[PDB]
Structure 1
């Protein structure tokens, strides 16, 4: 109901190992591949895996073109 689009997109970005770029409400632009996700959290990779919270994210732009069926 509430994840009909948010979950498949993140799953496709994770499986294909796409180097996405996340934008926080603070304006910072975090970089790194997505390792996992949930209803309120996303685990980045890059040099050191760090946690990010959904309520703090604004836009998740994929560096390379992503294809989600």
Structure 2
């Protein structure tokens, strides 16, 4: 595959503001600083570590290309 890495890499490279919705409906915002297979580092005031198992959808704030 796989689809995650190029999607997230594009967001990180272009420094696209994103909305990350968590499995509880709470929305987080910022720019994807780095990621691996378990977490995303989400930046603005501080870097916060978001567990992928808690994420429902990642929504870019503007159209982003990759594949």
With normalisation by structure 2, the TM-score equals: 0.95
Task: After TM superposition, list the pairs within 5 Å mapping 1:6-25 onto structure 2.
Answer: 6-25=4-23
Q: Secondary structure at the match of 1:14?
A: helix
> Is 1:61 paired with 2:62?
no
Number of paired residues?
67
Quick check: 1:38 aligned with 2:10?
no
Q: Could you tell me which residue of structure 1 aligns to residue 48 of structure 2?
A: 50
CA offsets, 1:32-60, max 9 Å, x none?
Answer: 00000000100000111100000000000
Give the CA RMSD over aligned residues. 0.8
Runs of 4+ residues over 6 Å off in structure 1: none
Give unmatched runs, 5+ long, in structure 2.
Answer: none
User: What are structure 1's unaligned runs of at least 5 residues?
Assistant: none
Greater strand proportion:
2
